[PDB]
Amino acid sequence: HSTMIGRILLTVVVIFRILIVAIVGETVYDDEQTMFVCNTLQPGCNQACYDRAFPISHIRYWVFQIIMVCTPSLCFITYSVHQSAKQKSKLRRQEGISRFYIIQVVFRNALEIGFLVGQYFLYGFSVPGLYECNRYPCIKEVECYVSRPTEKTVFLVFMFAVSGICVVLNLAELNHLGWRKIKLAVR
Amino acid sequence: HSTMIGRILLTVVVIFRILIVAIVGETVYDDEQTMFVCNTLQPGCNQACYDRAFPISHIRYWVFQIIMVCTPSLCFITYSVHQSAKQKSKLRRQEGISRFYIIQVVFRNALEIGFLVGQYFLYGFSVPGLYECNRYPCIKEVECYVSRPTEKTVFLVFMFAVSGICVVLNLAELNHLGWRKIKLAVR
Amino acid sequence: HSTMIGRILLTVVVIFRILIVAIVGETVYDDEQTMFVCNTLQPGCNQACYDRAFPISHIRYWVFQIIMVCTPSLCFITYSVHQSAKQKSKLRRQEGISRFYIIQVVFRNALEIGFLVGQYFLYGFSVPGLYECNRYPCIKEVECYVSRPTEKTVFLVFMFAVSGICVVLNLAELNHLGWRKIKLAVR
Amino acid sequence: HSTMIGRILLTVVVIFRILIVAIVGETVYDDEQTMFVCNTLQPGCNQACYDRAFPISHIRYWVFQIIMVCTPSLCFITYSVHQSAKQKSKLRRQEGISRFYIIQVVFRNALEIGFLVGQYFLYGFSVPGLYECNRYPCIKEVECYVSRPTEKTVFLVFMFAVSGICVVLNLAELNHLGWRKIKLAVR
Amino acid sequence: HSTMIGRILLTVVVIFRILIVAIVGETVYDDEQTMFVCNTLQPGCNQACYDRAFPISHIRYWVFQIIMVCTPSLCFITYSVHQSAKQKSKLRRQEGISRFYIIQVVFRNALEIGFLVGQYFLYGFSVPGLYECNRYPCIKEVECYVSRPTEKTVFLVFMFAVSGICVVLNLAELNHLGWRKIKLAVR
Amino acid sequence: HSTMIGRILLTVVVIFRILIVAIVGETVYDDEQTMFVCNTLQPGCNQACYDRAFPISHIRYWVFQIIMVCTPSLCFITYSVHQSAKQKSKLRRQEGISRFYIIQVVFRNALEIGFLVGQYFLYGFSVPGLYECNRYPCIKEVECYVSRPTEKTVFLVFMFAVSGICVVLNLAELNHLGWRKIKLAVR
Ligand SMILES: CC(C)CCC[C@@H](C)[C@H]1CC[C@H]2[C@@H]3CC=C4C[C@@H](OC(=O)CCC(=O)O)CC[C@]4(C)[C@H]3CC[C@]12C
Ligand SMILES: CC(C)CCC[C@@H](C)[C@H]1CC[C@H]2[C@@H]3CC=C4C[C@@H](OC(=O)CCC(=O)O)CC[C@]4(C)[C@H]3CC[C@]12C
Ligand SMILES: CC(C)CCC[C@@H](C)[C@H]1CC[C@H]2[C@@H]3CC=C4C[C@@H](OC(=O)CCC(=O)O)CC[C@]4(C)[C@H]3CC[C@]12C
Ligand SMILES: CC(C)CCC[C@@H](C)[C@H]1CC[C@H]2[C@@H]3CC=C4C[C@@H](OC(=O)CCC(=O)O)CC[C@]4(C)[C@H]3CC[C@]12C
Ligand SMILES: CC(C)CCC[C@@H](C)[C@H]1CC[C@H]2[C@@H]3CC=C4C[C@@H](OC(=O)CCC(=O)O)CC[C@]4(C)[C@H]3CC[C@]12C
Ligand SMILES: CC(C)CCC[C@@H](C)[C@H]1CC[C@H]2[C@@H]3CC=C4C[C@@H](OC(=O)CCC(=O)O)CC[C@]4(C)[C@H]3CC[C@]12C
Ligand SMILES: CCCCCCCCCCCCO[C@@H]1O[C@H](CO)[C@@H](O[C@H]2O[C@H](CO)[C@@H](O)[C@H](O)[C@H]2O)[C@H](O)[C@H]1O
Ligand SMILES: CCCCCCCCCCCCO[C@@H]1O[C@H](CO)[C@@H](O[C@H]2O[C@H](CO)[C@@H](O)[C@H](O)[C@H]2O)[C@H](O)[C@H]1O
Ligand SMILES: CCCCCCCCCCCCO[C@@H]1O[C@H](CO)[C@@H](O[C@H]2O[C@H](CO)[C@@H](O)[C@H](O)[C@H]2O)[C@H](O)[C@H]1O
Ligand SMILES: CCCCCCCCCCCCO[C@@H]1O[C@H](CO)[C@@H](O[C@H]2O[C@H](CO)[C@@H](O)[C@H](O)[C@H]2O)[C@H](O)[C@H]1O
Ligand SMILES: CCCCCCCCCCCCO[C@@H]1O[C@H](CO)[C@@H](O[C@H]2O[C@H](CO)[C@@H](O)[C@H](O)[C@H]2O)[C@H](O)[C@H]1O
Ligand SMILES: CCCCCCCCCCCCO[C@@H]1O[C@H](CO)[C@@H](O[C@H]2O[C@H](CO)[C@@H](O)[C@H](O)[C@H]2O)[C@H](O)[C@H]1O
């Protein structure tokens, strides 16, 4: 019950997060590297420490996740276009399209779960403003400073909450589908 | 009475504020971090003080509020599209759409009130040109300077006035709806 | 007489000024703050003096005026769309639309007059290349220098001339309307 | 004779110059102020000398000329739209449109001549790489250096040649019109 | 078997990689040259070492490969447009179009193989964070440092994996075509 | 024979080169002036040497050539639009259009040959990474260094190869036309 409104809410949340990231994410991380001050005098002790502290920026991971999530929708649209171009057998084709969509949404749920787990394990919750690094160029351990940690961690928490809401909606959709539909999709 | 003209005025104000922010807000806060001068010599005493003075910039909050306000309209549009795709029962569907729109506008009023309260409590009215900060990197209290405070506080006051006008229009719409419509929406 | 050609000329002037500002204004004021040199050594004596000399930049005022001027046109378009969606009474509706447009153009003339008066009182005619400032951060009076004053004052004079031409055209339209139409709009 | 092909060539040249300027002009003058080196030590001796050497940049004048030239075409299009909306009298209206277009093209030729004369008198042909300036901030005469003079003067010469070609085409069109058409337009 | 779904998946992968690169590649390599620190004091020892370490950036090669891959599709579209404009002979024309498409896809597979081999031989897998260079401007061997190596090598590995998947799909399509179709295309 | 496929290939090559330049050329030459290091201490010895080494950048010449090449196509399109608006005489008009197109393609071949000769004579093949300059501001001969020479010369070689391919295709088209068509176009 209430499946269509749930799908509508999920689409609204997807559009909301896509617009929010495409508007704000570029500006926050536009000059992250430039605003890096570290207590050191050895040349090259700054770039190595910045790479160690932030190997992959959060914006790249978010963009990658958003682009990867939309691929089943794109392939479904292409398959529907091909089916329309091609045209008792119609009912069989409709059933095949339905089971294809079911498998697509299951794969989308799996991808969302994997992306959420990876984001949780990689970045975490809070962004440390102060970092301690010791690589080959730096003779001893040095203390570097990060710029704007509060905004980064707040936006990361918001992204995690949005991903959790999407996961909950996807689980609700899977529960609406149910064991019989899962078994039918398997066979 | 005069409900349609009030809704037209509200839409005009929304378009006005959206265009104004999308035109001017990026340029004002484009290089806020760069134009930061503080009386200190300790490395890292500038970024921490800037983060303390401005944890979240006003432009991010305004963009977030604008994007959040438009979500009920987007979900209503999607629901209308779904209803059109699906098509005595028509009258019942129209009544359901009407009560859905009523609940949507009530939620929009609540969200606007919450956003206005948060903006008032977080930023306030005036932006202090001079700041005094004392964090761990800075040994003692230091005096930092902010660039272009007058423009920031003027634009913040204008945004507050626009939000107040929108709140007044929303309250007028709720009064036009009235207790009977609220009770019907509840049940 | 010659009312339609006057309105056409006014629209042409509006499009001309909008295109001119949207093309040139961003580049002139793109790096105004960076090109600021002042004879001082006290930290923070530059930002405060720049804020004192230029509290609100001319481009922001021009953009605000242009956006505010177009609001009656937008509300008229929305009202016309609503009237078209809704559809002896037709003649009454047409008369109401005509008087609404008359009131709208009167309000537009008033807004243009107010904006012109504010621009004249705030900025003036010439931009002083050399400024003398004495605020709290600066111990004594200091002499700061402004970059590209000639272009700024020339473009300000051109904007003032365009606003004057628009005001003259609006006054001509009001004279064409006349006392009888004003009295009819009042009642 | 060969009037239509001449008008086609004029339109092609206008599109060519518009595309060329809109593509290249922004990049050449993007950082003209930054690449300014002058043999001086007095603060403020650089901005004043740059303003004296280049009061108005060539790109602003070219953009202003291009925008001003297109205004008669825009007003003619608006008048044609109004005439279409409004609809022996048709022949009179067509004759009025023809004489209006004749007056418009005469005004366009006059504006082009004035703009060409102003460009010739203001900028000239060659851009001096070395400048000598002596204003109030600079105690004595100082020698400043300009960046990329050859490209600026080459593009200025090309713009002058394009303007001359346009003037020649406009004069050919005026000769095709002739004394009888000029007299008819006058009365 | 499963040829159409394979082509759909290949198109989806192409769109995915195109969007991913067009979104992320510009920002990563936006300021690669600026963030270059090398242990040297001789002027010109930095630019030569940067050129030696990175003669051609990865983004240029990826853009070139993507643009080159799409050329057979563009020429096929143009040929189809010409055939549509031009219109037992229809069957012969369809067979000619089919064999033209077969030759086009064979050429596309060859181009993809060549581009993959070139990318593997030129860049490799890992980006060395530390480089040792000795050119004419630098008296002796000097040690330069690269900024953000981990992101560059991760994205390069992802691009290599995407190219491998595309190559596998193209080989599957060629196997579906088969020896008989290859022989028919040859003659 | 094979004229239509040759024209299709020429159009494909034109689109390919236009897309390639519009994508990559801006980024390569975005900050050429900034990354200029020369062994000198006299102020103004850098800008003059940079102007001497690179009077006109390659990107400007390429953009100018591309824009100039497309002008006959634009004028042909405008002439076709005029002919369509205007409408035994039809056959004569078609023959006139054909001979006009022949003259247009001959002029395009001549322009391409001239542009190729100019590019070969001006820039050459290789970009010298090291330059020796001696102008008035510099007391003696000084050694300046160029940034990213390998990419510039590689892209220049690619542009030369593309221009050569276009010239070969144009010569093939002219050979297909032949002496009889040339004589008919002359008279
Ligand atoms: C659809 C519903 C289920 C969404 C619920 C969202 C939660 C997954 C999010 C929302 C707010 C989050 C919390 C916001 C703030 C914090 C404080 C934060 O504390 C620190 O960063 C310091 C201590 C530490 O290192 O853990 C730990 C995570 C936590 C509890 C977060 C855990 C995850 C929460 C509960
Ligand atoms: C639809 C209608 C009801 C909109 C009305 C808008 C008001 C909510 C705004 C418009 C102008 C605002 C005022 C503009 C200027 C100031 C001065 C300002 O003073 C300071 O910043 C220094 C003193 C202090 O710290 O409070 C205090 C807020 C106040 C009164 C503002 C309070 C809120 C006002 C009345
Ligand atoms: C439709 C018609 C009526 C438009 C007419 C436009 C005028 C309103 C503008 C056009 C040119 C302007 C003038 C251009 C130059 C100057 C010099 C300027 O002198 C200075 O800046 C130094 C002296 C001082 O401080 O006043 C004073 C304003 C004035 C006369 C301007 C006054 C306003 C003028 C007449
Ligand atoms: C449609 C036809 C008539 C267009 C013809 C274009 C001319 C108006 C242009 C094209 C090339 C120009 C010439 C190109 C180069 C120079 C050298 C230039 O010499 C200098 O800059 C140094 C000497 C000085 O200070 O005059 C003087 C202008 C001149 C002759 C230019 C004069 C104007 C010319 C002839
Ligand atoms: C459609 C299927 C067949 C795609 C398979 C993709 C492979 C071509 C890619 C995916 C992951 C890649 C591997 C990811 C990581 C590494 C570690 C890497 O190690 C180093 O960089 C250090 C040692 C060295 O210098 O080789 C060597 C390449 C390798 C094995 C890569 C080899 C190529 C792999 C297997
Ligand atoms: C449609 C077909 C005919 C296109 C053929 C393209 C040629 C016009 C291009 C492609 C590769 C080019 C060559 C690539 C590399 C070089 C090395 C280059 O050597 C140097 O830069 C150092 C020596 C010197 O100063 O000449 C001289 C030009 C040359 C032979 C180029 C000459 C022109 C070539 C043959
Ligand atoms: C699509 C699916 C993708 C799956 C992705 C799986 C990625 C797995 C990454 C394994 C990384 C192991 O290395 C891991 O590094 C991270 C961050 O660098 C460390 O993380 C630590 O520092 C970061 C900040 O730097 C803190 O936010 C975090 O709370 C803390 O645990 C982990 O303690 C360590 O375990
Ligand atoms: C969508 C709904 C969102 C609800 C949002 C609720 C946000 C609540 C934030 C609680 C913050 C508590 O911390 C609060 O910090 C702000 C600004 O940092 C302080 O604010 C103080 O400094 C700021 C500038 O920095 C001044 O403009 C302000 O007038 C002054 O009160 C408050 O004195 C303090 O109470
Ligand atoms: C939509 C309607 C808006 C109405 C706007 C009304 C704005 C009123 C602003 C009142 C400002 C009072 O402060 C006013 O500051 C301006 C500029 O800062 C001063 O202006 C002075 O300096 C400026 C440059 O800085 C010169 O160009 C000007 O000629 C000179 O008078 C005035 O002498 C002073 O009176
Ligand atoms: C739409 C029509 C517009 C009409 C525009 C009329 C503008 C008239 C400007 C009058 C300017 C008088 O001041 C004029 O300055 C210019 C450039 O600043 C000087 O010009 C001098 O220097 C410039 C470079 O700086 C050289 O390129 C030029 O060859 C040389 O003559 C003139 O010698 C002087 O006469
Ligand atoms: C469309 C088809 C294009 C075909 C392209 C063919 C390009 C062939 C390039 C030949 C280059 C020979 O020079 C080649 O330089 C590369 C990188 O510069 C060196 O590569 C070496 O350094 C790079 C980084 O700099 C490492 O990532 C790599 O693992 C290592 O081998 C090779 O050891 C050397 O053989
Ligand atoms: C549309 C048609 C356009 C026709 C264009 C005709 C342009 C003619 C330019 C004549 C220039 C004469 O000056 C010419 O300068 C170039 C480059 O500046 C010199 O060129 C020299 O240096 C350049 C780099 O700077 C090398 O790449 C080149 O191999 C070498 O010959 C020539 O040796 C000299 O002859």
Side-chain angles (χ1 to χ4, degrees), chain C residues 28-29 32 54 58 62 127 146-157:
Chain C
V28 189
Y29 301 87
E32 170 185 58
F54 297 96
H58 314 262
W62 291 322
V127 169
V146 194
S147 65
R148 296 179 182 178
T150 288
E151 190 177 6
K152 294 178 189 292
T153 180
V154 161
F155 189 75
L156 175 68
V157 163

PDB file of all heavy atoms in Angstrom, chain C residues 28-29 32 54 58 62 127 146-157:
ATOM      1  N   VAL C  28      33.678  44.701 -15.175  1.00  0.00           N
ATOM      2  CA  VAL C  28      34.264  45.924 -14.631  1.00  0.00           C
ATOM      3  C   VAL C  28      34.471  45.803 -13.126  1.00  0.00           C
ATOM      4  O   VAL C  28      35.518  46.193 -12.596  1.00  0.00           O
ATOM      5  CB  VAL C  28      33.388  47.141 -14.984  1.00  0.00           C
ATOM      6  CG1 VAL C  28      34.099  48.432 -14.607  1.00  0.00           C
ATOM      7  CG2 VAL C  28      33.045  47.137 -16.463  1.00  0.00           C
ATOM      8  N   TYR C  29      33.482  45.260 -12.416  1.00  0.00           N
ATOM      9  CA  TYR C  29      33.537  45.127 -10.967  1.00  0.00           C
ATOM     10  C   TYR C  29      33.947  43.727 -10.525  1.00  0.00           C
ATOM     11  O   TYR C  29      33.706  43.352  -9.372  1.00  0.00           O
ATOM     12  CB  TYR C  29      32.188  45.501 -10.351  1.00  0.00           C
ATOM     13  CG  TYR C  29      31.739  46.913 -10.658  1.00  0.00           C
ATOM     14  CD1 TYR C  29      31.025  47.201 -11.814  1.00  0.00           C
ATOM     15  CD2 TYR C  29      32.026  47.957  -9.788  1.00  0.00           C
ATOM     16  CE1 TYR C  29      30.613  48.490 -12.097  1.00  0.00           C
ATOM     17  CE2 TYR C  29      31.617  49.250 -10.063  1.00  0.00           C
ATOM     18  CZ  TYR C  29      30.911  49.509 -11.219  1.00  0.00           C
ATOM     19  OH  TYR C  29      30.503  50.794 -11.497  1.00  0.00           O
ATOM     20  N   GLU C  32      37.332  44.517  -8.235  1.00  0.00           N
ATOM     21  CA  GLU C  32      37.478  45.854  -7.667  1.00  0.00           C
ATOM     22  C   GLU C  32      38.217  45.815  -6.335  1.00  0.00           C
ATOM     23  O   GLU C  32      39.069  46.671  -6.066  1.00  0.00           O
ATOM     24  CB  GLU C  32      36.104  46.503  -7.502  1.00  0.00           C
ATOM     25  CG  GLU C  32      36.117  47.799  -6.708  1.00  0.00           C
ATOM     26  CD  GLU C  32      34.724  48.344  -6.460  1.00  0.00           C
ATOM     27  OE1 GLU C  32      33.901  47.623  -5.860  1.00  0.00           O
ATOM     28  OE2 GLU C  32      34.452  49.494  -6.867  1.00  0.00           O
ATOM     29  N   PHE C  54      33.098  52.410  -0.587  1.00  0.00           N
ATOM     30  CA  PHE C  54      32.093  51.764  -1.431  1.00  0.00           C
ATOM     31  C   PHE C  54      31.275  50.806  -0.577  1.00  0.00           C
ATOM     32  O   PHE C  54      31.521  49.591  -0.575  1.00  0.00           O
ATOM     33  CB  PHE C  54      32.746  51.035  -2.606  1.00  0.00           C
ATOM     34  CG  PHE C  54      33.481  51.942  -3.550  1.00  0.00           C
ATOM     35  CD1 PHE C  54      34.849  52.127  -3.430  1.00  0.00           C
ATOM     36  CD2 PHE C  54      32.805  52.608  -4.559  1.00  0.00           C
ATOM     37  CE1 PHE C  54      35.529  52.961  -4.297  1.00  0.00           C
ATOM     38  CE2 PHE C  54      33.480  53.443  -5.430  1.00  0.00           C
ATOM     39  CZ  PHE C  54      34.844  53.620  -5.298  1.00  0.00           C
ATOM     40  N   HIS C  58      27.796  49.833  -7.359  1.00  0.00           N
ATOM     41  CA  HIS C  58      26.782  50.319  -8.291  1.00  0.00           C
ATOM     42  C   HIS C  58      26.081  49.177  -9.015  1.00  0.00           C
ATOM     43  O   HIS C  58      24.888  49.284  -9.334  1.00  0.00           O
ATOM     44  CB  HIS C  58      27.419  51.271  -9.303  1.00  0.00           C
ATOM     45  CG  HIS C  58      28.331  52.287  -8.690  1.00  0.00           C
ATOM     46  ND1 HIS C  58      27.931  53.578  -8.416  1.00  0.00           N
ATOM     47  CD2 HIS C  58      29.625  52.205  -8.300  1.00  0.00           C
ATOM     48  CE1 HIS C  58      28.939  54.246  -7.883  1.00  0.00           C
ATOM     49  NE2 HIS C  58      29.979  53.435  -7.801  1.00  0.00           N
ATOM     50  N   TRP C  62      22.050  48.601  -9.589  1.00  0.00           N
ATOM     51  CA  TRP C  62      21.465  48.516 -10.925  1.00  0.00           C
ATOM     52  C   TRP C  62      20.701  47.212 -11.119  1.00  0.00           C
ATOM     53  O   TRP C  62      19.591  47.214 -11.667  1.00  0.00           O
ATOM     54  CB  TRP C  62      22.551  48.666 -11.990  1.00  0.00           C
ATOM     55  CG  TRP C  62      23.132  50.044 -12.058  1.00  0.00           C
ATOM     56  CD1 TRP C  62      22.463  51.223 -11.906  1.00  0.00           C
ATOM     57  CD2 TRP C  62      24.501  50.387 -12.303  1.00  0.00           C
ATOM     58  NE1 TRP C  62      23.331  52.280 -12.037  1.00  0.00           N
ATOM     59  CE2 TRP C  62      24.588  51.793 -12.281  1.00  0.00           C
ATOM     60  CE3 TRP C  62      25.662  49.643 -12.536  1.00  0.00           C
ATOM     61  CZ2 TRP C  62      25.789  52.470 -12.484  1.00  0.00           C
ATOM     62  CZ3 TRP C  62      26.853  50.318 -12.737  1.00  0.00           C
ATOM     63  CH2 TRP C  62      26.907  51.717 -12.711  1.00  0.00           C
ATOM     64  N   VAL C 127      33.167  59.492  -9.654  1.00  0.00           N
ATOM     65  CA  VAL C 127      33.763  58.563  -8.697  1.00  0.00           C
ATOM     66  C   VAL C 127      35.146  59.091  -8.334  1.00  0.00           C
ATOM     67  O   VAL C 127      36.019  59.158  -9.213  1.00  0.00           O
ATOM     68  CB  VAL C 127      33.851  57.140  -9.269  1.00  0.00           C
ATOM     69  CG1 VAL C 127      34.712  56.262  -8.373  1.00  0.00           C
ATOM     70  CG2 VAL C 127      32.460  56.547  -9.431  1.00  0.00           C
ATOM     71  N   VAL C 146      41.655  54.380  -5.748  1.00  0.00           N
ATOM     72  CA  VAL C 146      40.637  53.583  -6.423  1.00  0.00           C
ATOM     73  C   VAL C 146      41.114  53.273  -7.836  1.00  0.00           C
ATOM     74  O   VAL C 146      41.801  54.079  -8.473  1.00  0.00           O
ATOM     75  CB  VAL C 146      39.273  54.305  -6.445  1.00  0.00           C
ATOM     76  CG1 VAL C 146      38.163  53.342  -6.842  1.00  0.00           C
ATOM     77  CG2 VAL C 146      38.980  54.927  -5.090  1.00  0.00           C
ATOM     78  N   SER C 147      40.745  52.092  -8.323  1.00  0.00           N
ATOM     79  CA  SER C 147      41.165  51.615  -9.634  1.00  0.00           C
ATOM     80  C   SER C 147      40.042  51.812 -10.646  1.00  0.00           C
ATOM     81  O   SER C 147      38.884  51.486 -10.368  1.00  0.00           O
ATOM     82  CB  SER C 147      41.565  50.140  -9.574  1.00  0.00           C
ATOM     83  OG  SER C 147      40.452  49.321  -9.259  1.00  0.00           O
ATOM     84  N   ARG C 148      40.397  52.350 -11.817  1.00  0.00           N
ATOM     85  CA  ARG C 148      39.485  52.584 -12.933  1.00  0.00           C
ATOM     86  C   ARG C 148      38.308  53.465 -12.528  1.00  0.00           C
ATOM     87  O   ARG C 148      37.161  52.997 -12.525  1.00  0.00           O
ATOM     88  CB  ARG C 148      38.970  51.256 -13.492  1.00  0.00           C
ATOM     89  CG  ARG C 148      40.045  50.370 -14.098  1.00  0.00           C
ATOM     90  CD  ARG C 148      39.453  49.061 -14.598  1.00  0.00           C
ATOM     91  NE  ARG C 148      40.469  48.173 -15.149  1.00  0.00           N
ATOM     92  CZ  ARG C 148      40.227  46.953 -15.610  1.00  0.00           C
ATOM     93  NH1 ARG C 148      39.009  46.439 -15.598  1.00  0.00           N
ATOM     94  NH2 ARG C 148      41.234  46.231 -16.093  1.00  0.00           N
ATOM     95  N   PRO C 149      38.536  54.737 -12.179  1.00  0.00           N
ATOM     96  CA  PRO C 149      37.409  55.606 -11.817  1.00  0.00           C
ATOM     97  C   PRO C 149      36.667  56.135 -13.034  1.00  0.00           C
ATOM     98  O   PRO C 149      35.445  56.324 -12.996  1.00  0.00           O
ATOM     99  CB  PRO C 149      38.078  56.748 -11.033  1.00  0.00           C
ATOM    100  CG  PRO C 149      39.533  56.345 -10.870  1.00  0.00           C
ATOM    101  CD  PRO C 149      39.823  55.426 -12.006  1.00  0.00           C
ATOM    102  N   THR C 150      37.407  56.381 -14.119  1.00  0.00           N
ATOM    103  CA  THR C 150      36.821  56.999 -15.306  1.00  0.00           C
ATOM    104  C   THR C 150      35.749  56.108 -15.923  1.00  0.00           C
ATOM    105  O   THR C 150      34.658  56.577 -16.269  1.00  0.00           O
ATOM    106  CB  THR C 150      37.918  57.313 -16.326  1.00  0.00           C
ATOM    107  OG1 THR C 150      38.704  58.416 -15.860  1.00  0.00           O
ATOM    108  CG2 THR C 150      37.313  57.666 -17.677  1.00  0.00           C
ATOM    109  N   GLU C 151      36.041  54.814 -16.065  1.00  0.00           N
ATOM    110  CA  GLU C 151      35.054  53.898 -16.626  1.00  0.00           C
ATOM    111  C   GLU C 151      33.821  53.812 -15.738  1.00  0.00           C
ATOM    112  O   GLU C 151      32.685  53.807 -16.233  1.00  0.00           O
ATOM    113  CB  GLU C 151      35.672  52.513 -16.819  1.00  0.00           C
ATOM    114  CG  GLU C 151      34.807  51.556 -17.621  1.00  0.00           C
ATOM    115  CD  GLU C 151      35.485  50.222 -17.863  1.00  0.00           C
ATOM    116  OE1 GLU C 151      36.582  50.004 -17.307  1.00  0.00           O
ATOM    117  OE2 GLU C 151      34.922  49.392 -18.607  1.00  0.00           O
ATOM    118  N   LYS C 152      34.024  53.757 -14.420  1.00  0.00           N
ATOM    119  CA  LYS C 152      32.899  53.658 -13.497  1.00  0.00           C
ATOM    120  C   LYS C 152      31.998  54.883 -13.598  1.00  0.00           C
ATOM    121  O   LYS C 152      30.772  54.757 -13.692  1.00  0.00           O
ATOM    122  CB  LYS C 152      33.410  53.478 -12.067  1.00  0.00           C
ATOM    123  CG  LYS C 152      34.139  52.166 -11.831  1.00  0.00           C
ATOM    124  CD  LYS C 152      34.656  52.071 -10.406  1.00  0.00           C
ATOM    125  CE  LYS C 152      35.579  50.876 -10.232  1.00  0.00           C
ATOM    126  NZ  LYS C 152      34.850  49.583 -10.352  1.00  0.00           N
ATOM    127  N   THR C 153      32.590  56.082 -13.601  1.00  0.00           N
ATOM    128  CA  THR C 153      31.763  57.283 -13.661  1.00  0.00           C
ATOM    129  C   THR C 153      31.104  57.446 -15.027  1.00  0.00           C
ATOM    130  O   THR C 153      29.963  57.912 -15.105  1.00  0.00           O
ATOM    131  CB  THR C 153      32.575  58.531 -13.297  1.00  0.00           C
ATOM    132  OG1 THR C 153      31.733  59.688 -13.373  1.00  0.00           O
ATOM    133  CG2 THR C 153      33.756  58.722 -14.230  1.00  0.00           C
ATOM    134  N   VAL C 154      31.782  57.045 -16.109  1.00  0.00           N
ATOM    135  CA  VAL C 154      31.170  57.119 -17.432  1.00  0.00           C
ATOM    136  C   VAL C 154      29.964  56.190 -17.516  1.00  0.00           C
ATOM    137  O   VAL C 154      28.895  56.575 -18.012  1.00  0.00           O
ATOM    138  CB  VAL C 154      32.211  56.799 -18.521  1.00  0.00           C
ATOM    139  CG1 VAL C 154      31.526  56.408 -19.821  1.00  0.00           C
ATOM    140  CG2 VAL C 154      33.131  57.991 -18.740  1.00  0.00           C
ATOM    141  N   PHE C 155      30.109  54.957 -17.022  1.00  0.00           N
ATOM    142  CA  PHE C 155      28.995  54.018 -17.087  1.00  0.00           C
ATOM    143  C   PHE C 155      27.862  54.448 -16.161  1.00  0.00           C
ATOM    144  O   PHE C 155      26.684  54.258 -16.484  1.00  0.00           O
ATOM    145  CB  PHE C 155      29.475  52.608 -16.751  1.00  0.00           C
ATOM    146  CG  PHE C 155      28.448  51.543 -17.010  1.00  0.00           C
ATOM    147  CD1 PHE C 155      28.173  51.132 -18.304  1.00  0.00           C
ATOM    148  CD2 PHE C 155      27.760  50.952 -15.965  1.00  0.00           C
ATOM    149  CE1 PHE C 155      27.228  50.154 -18.550  1.00  0.00           C
ATOM    150  CE2 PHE C 155      26.815  49.973 -16.204  1.00  0.00           C
ATOM    151  CZ  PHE C 155      26.549  49.573 -17.498  1.00  0.00           C
ATOM    152  N   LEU C 156      28.196  55.042 -15.010  1.00  0.00           N
ATOM    153  CA  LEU C 156      27.167  55.581 -14.125  1.00  0.00           C
ATOM    154  C   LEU C 156      26.400  56.716 -14.793  1.00  0.00           C
ATOM    155  O   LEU C 156      25.172  56.804 -14.668  1.00  0.00           O
ATOM    156  CB  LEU C 156      27.801  56.059 -12.818  1.00  0.00           C
ATOM    157  CG  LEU C 156      26.886  56.756 -11.810  1.00  0.00           C
ATOM    158  CD1 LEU C 156      25.876  55.780 -11.233  1.00  0.00           C
ATOM    159  CD2 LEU C 156      27.701  57.405 -10.702  1.00  0.00           C
ATOM    160  N   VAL C 157      27.108  57.600 -15.500  1.00  0.00           N
ATOM    161  CA  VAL C 157      26.444  58.684 -16.219  1.00  0.00           C
ATOM    162  C   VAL C 157      25.537  58.123 -17.308  1.00  0.00           C
ATOM    163  O   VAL C 157      24.417  58.609 -17.516  1.00  0.00           O
ATOM    164  CB  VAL C 157      27.487  59.662 -16.790  1.00  0.00           C
ATOM    165  CG1 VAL C 157      26.868  60.547 -17.862  1.00  0.00           C
ATOM    166  CG2 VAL C 157      28.084  60.509 -15.678  1.00  0.00           C
TER     167      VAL C 157
END
